[PDB]
């Protein structure tokens, strides 16, 4: 028997406005969700997610094998030693069904001081040929800033929920330095679906991606309408309902660190489902040198002995560890 998680729908539209009490009522809902199973759906978010899905499908369904090698990250193409994060992540027919394309802050150019300094986790995005993929780069860059805007407002809700002033997180989330990323993931329909691409959980469930916590402050996720996610609870894994009109929001492990686990990073996994679908996360990451002072809203004095953690080190370590534990995607 598999139960179903309570995933509240939260109208986040007040977070874009100037009605402070309405913002507090959104914040209370974020607090309640974050203290329960974590996840909530942000609704009334203002982003055209139908166009996001359409433009993403057009890219996934038209990119050629040649273009995939030309854009491939270093894990697939030794010529591309600078691509640890950004680029194409290839499928392996018979072995690995998922494939994806990751891009970073469009302001990371050769002019940017973090690129000049060669700081880890900063890379210049790679893109397919414009004439072969008309409008794709422009769509993808616009989307980065659209979802940046939503995420900034969500971060105001999380700050208010934790008893802070509304810019407590968002002040560290800036277009000039954010390490945030978009990933356009394709999960294919395959007939036959190769068993080598399916993992078996300890509890017997067939999975496409094993349990993990997110490497993020928060994660702002669109998925097409195919149920697949499960969240761990003390009584076992519970199904998260799909909703292709909203964004599924959760805390990542940086939030758990800074709140002394008051808002935990929910453990979750991806069930195997033989269906063509999309998983389009935006990982809300701060800047490389961003440090948030930890606190514990359970203590009267709010004091935490947890050490302040630099975001860039957290991200570097976290992305490597996730690959080591859950496989190169
Ligand atoms: C759980 C979903 C969000 C999705 N999984 C994922 O996105 C998984 C787990 S959160 N995330 C990752 O692999 C980290 C990608 C980091 C990215 N290359 C970057 O450099 O920033 C899936 O559908 O498999
Ligand atoms: Fe995740």
Q: Which residue has the tokens 């894994």?
A: 237
Residue 277 marked as a ligand binder: yes
**CA 193, 194, 195: angle at the middle one, nearest 5?**
115
Are 43 and 153 in contact by the 8 Å Cβ rule? The answer is no
Instruction: Give the closest residue to 169 by CA, choosing from 141, 306, 267, 161.
Output: 161
Pick the ligand that lies closest to the CA of residue 318.
1
Residue 214 marked as a ligand binder: yes
User: Is residue 313 one of the residues assigned to a domain?
Assistant: yes
Helices (H), ranges, 123-264? 136-161, 253-258
- What is the C-alpha separation between 323 and 85, in angstroms, rounded? 11
Q: Which of the 8 DSSP states describes residue 172?
A: G
User: Is residue 311 one of the residues assigned to a domain?
Assistant: yes
User: Is residue 1 one of the residues assigned to a domain?
Assistant: no
- What is the C-alpha separation between 319 and 298, in angstroms, rounded? 30
User: Is residue 2 one of the residues assigned to a domain?
Assistant: no
Quote the distance between the C-alpha of residue 15 and its chain's center: 20
- What is the C-alpha separation between 125 and 205, in angstroms, rounded? 36
- CATH code of the domain containing 310: 2.60.120.330
User: Is residue 13 one of the residues assigned to a domain?
Assistant: yes
Residue 212 marked as a ligand binder: yes
H/E stretch holding 65 reads helix 65-71
Q: What are 324's two structure tokens?
A: 């080591």
Q: What is the DSSP string of 33-63?
A: HHHTTS-EEEES----HHHHHHHHHHHHTT-
Instruction: Write out the residue range of the structural domain in which residue 185 sits.
Output: 9-326
Quote the distance between the C-alpha of residue 75 and its chain's center: 20
Q: Is the dihedral of CA 188, 194, 198, 200 positive or negative?
A: positive
Task: Give the Å distances, CA to CA, from 54 to 50, 67, 321.
Answer: 6, 20, 33
- Contacts with 117 (C-beta within 8 Å, 6 or more apart), sequence order: none
CA of 283 to the centre of ligand 1 (A): 8
SS3 category, 290 = coil
Q: Which of the 8 DSSP states describes residue 327?
A: -
**Ligand 1 atom 17: the closest Cα is on which residue?**
85
Q: What are 173's two structure tokens?
A: 């989330």
- What is the C-alpha separation between 230 and 30, in angstroms, rounded? 19
Residue 257 marked as a ligand binder: no
Q: What are 284's two structure tokens?
A: 């809300």
**Ligand 1 atom 21: the closest Cα is on which residue?**
181
- What is the C-alpha separation between 128 and 57, in angstroms, rounded? 15
Specify the experimental method.
X-ray
SS3 category, 32 = helix
- List the beta bridge partners of residue 230: 239, 269
Residue 230: is the preceding peptide bond cis (ω within 30°)?
Answer: no
Buried b (16+ CB within 10 A) or exposed e, 278-305: bbbbbbbbbbbebbbebbbbeeeeeebe
- What is the C-alpha separation between 165 and 248, in angstroms, rounded? 24
- What is the C-alpha separation between 174 and 288, in angstroms, rounded? 11
Let me know how long the chain is: 329
User: Is residue 134 one of the residues assigned to a domain?
Assistant: yes
User: Is residue 4 one of the residues assigned to a domain?
Assistant: no
Instruction: Give the closest residue to 271 by CA, choosing from 190, 180, 209.
Output: 209
102 lines ligand 1 (CB under 6 A): yes
Are 160 and 166 in contact by the 8 Å Cβ rule? The answer is yes
Cα dihedral value 326, 264, 30, 179, nearest 10: -50
User: Is residue 174 one of the residues assigned to a domain?
Assistant: yes
Q: Give the β-pairing of 247-251 and 218-223.
A: antiparallel
**Ligand 1 atom 8: the closest Cα is on which residue?**
214
Instruction: Give the closest residue to 218 by CA, choosing from 263, 171, 177.
Output: 263
Total number of domains in the chain: 1
Q: What are 62's two structure tokens?
A: 């038209």
**Ligand 1 atom 3: the closest Cα is on which residue?**
281
Which ligand 1 atom is at minimum distance from the Cα of 98?
24
170 lines ligand 1 (CB under 6 A): no
209 lines ligand 1 (CB under 6 A): yes
Tell me whether residue 106 is exposed, middle or buried, using C-beta atoms within 10 angstroms of its C-beta: 0 to 12, 13 to 18, 19 or more: middle
CA of 185 to the centre of ligand 1 (A): 9
Catalytic (active-site) positions: 209, 212, 214, 268
99 lines ligand 1 (CB under 6 A): no
């Amino acid at each position: 028997s598999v139960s179903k998680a309570n995933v509240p729908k939260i109208d986040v539209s007040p977070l874009f406005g100037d009605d402070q009490a309405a913002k507090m009522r959104v914040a209370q809902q974020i607090d309640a969700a974050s203290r329960d199973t974590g996840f909530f759906y942000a609704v009334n978010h203002g982003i055209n997610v139908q166009r996001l899905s359409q433009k993403t499908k057009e890219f996934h369904m038209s990119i050629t094998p040649e273009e995939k090698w030309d854009l491939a990250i270093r894990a697939y193409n030794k010529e591309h030693q600078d691509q640890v994060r950004a680029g194409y992540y290839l499928s392996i027919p018979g072995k690995k069904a998922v494939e994806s394309f990751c891009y970073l802050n469009p302001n990371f150019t050769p002019d940017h001081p973090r690129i000049q300094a060669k700081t880890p986790t900063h890379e210049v995005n790679v893109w397919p040929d414009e004439t072969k993929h008309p409008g794709f780069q422009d769509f993808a860059e616009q989307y980065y800033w659209d979802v940046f805007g939503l995420s900034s407002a969500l971060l105001k809700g999380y700050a208010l929920a934790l008893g802070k002033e509304e810019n407590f997180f968002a002040r560290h989330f800036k277009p000039d330095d954010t390490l945030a990323s978009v990933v356009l993931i394709r999960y294919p329909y395959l007939d036959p679906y190769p068993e080598a691409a399916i993992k078996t959980a300890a509890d017997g469930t067939k999975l496409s991606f094993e349990w993990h916590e997110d490497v993020s402050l928060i994660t702002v996720l669109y998925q097409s309408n195919v149920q697949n996610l499960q969240v761990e609870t003390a009584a076992g894994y519970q199904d998260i309902e799909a909703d292709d009109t909203g964004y599924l929001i959760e805390c990542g492990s940086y939030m758990a660190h800074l709140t002394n686990n008051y808002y935990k990073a929910p453990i979750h996994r991806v069930k195997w489902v033989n269906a063509e679908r999309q998983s389009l996360p935006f990982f809300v990451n701060l800047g490389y040198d961003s440090v948030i002072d930890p606190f514990d809203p359970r203590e009267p004095n709010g004091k935490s002995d947890r050490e302040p953690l630099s975001y860039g080190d957290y991200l570097q370590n976290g992305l490597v560890s996730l690959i080591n534990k859950n496989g190169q995607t």
